[PDB]
Write a protein that binds this ligand. Sequence first.
Ligand SMILES: *C/C=C(C)/C=C/C=C(C)/C=C/C1=C(C)CCCC1(C)C
Ligand code: NA
Length: 270
Amino acid sequence: TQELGANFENFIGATEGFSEIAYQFTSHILTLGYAVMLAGLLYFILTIKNVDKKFQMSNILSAVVMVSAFLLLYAQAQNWTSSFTFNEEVGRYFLDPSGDLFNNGYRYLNWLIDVPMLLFQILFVVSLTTSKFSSVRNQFWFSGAMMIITGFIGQFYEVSNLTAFLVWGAISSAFFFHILWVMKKVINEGKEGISPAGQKILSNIWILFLISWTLYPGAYLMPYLTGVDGFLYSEDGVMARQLVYTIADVSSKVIYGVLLGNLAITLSKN
Ligand SMILES: *C/C=C(C)/C=C/C=C(C)/C=C/C1=C(C)CCCC1(C)C
Ligand code: NA
């Protein structure tokens, strides 16, 4: 009965501890994460005049997303280093009873805030054809909120009840597939009535969206992708999970935002 270690990170940190490499790599990847958001924030502020007025809500939403992600990923980065402390006799980092313990709340809150804005912002760059703005918006927001809420419920049970962790994750995946379906419709309608250069950027946005958003359930399942007591059921699964989350964050937020800005610029060229 391991009482101190909630989530898989605390469980590993309370039982086997983290190697110096695992601890430092995770710290550095999380720091790179918030550093890139700060850089993106300055980018989306400074380039806002490069797009026509009618598209600027997309730049605005990118910047607000950068603020939320910078703040919350900074908090998560400090939560990592504060939750695990070095033991000299073993030579590894263990869960620190005097710390606050690692907490996925920061990242999940960031998702709850950012998912609706990221889905919303494309609607200020492309034009729909036969779909209604309000209908697409409401579907994005409802399914986006439900995907994050049900995923957050599942993640509590990650250590204590693997069955609940997977079932809630499956429910969350149902809302995710709904979002993918709606976004593909948005991309297709967005391609109608624009230049071939604009259509090519939208093609790339779809691939970037599909890959980067699918990385999140992949990192959710990461500790179990090689089975209980498998190679990933260890600090290596923690490292891979946090690496994939950070890649996903930079791609789904920053790169996505840059591509939408590039689309908005191209649309003014006709
Ligand atoms: C920058 C924030 C982004 C775009 C967050 C997106 C998060 C999701 C696509 C995560 C969805 C999940 C599942 C599909 C199943 C497992 C639980 C989640 C919440 C990780
Ligand atoms: Na520490």
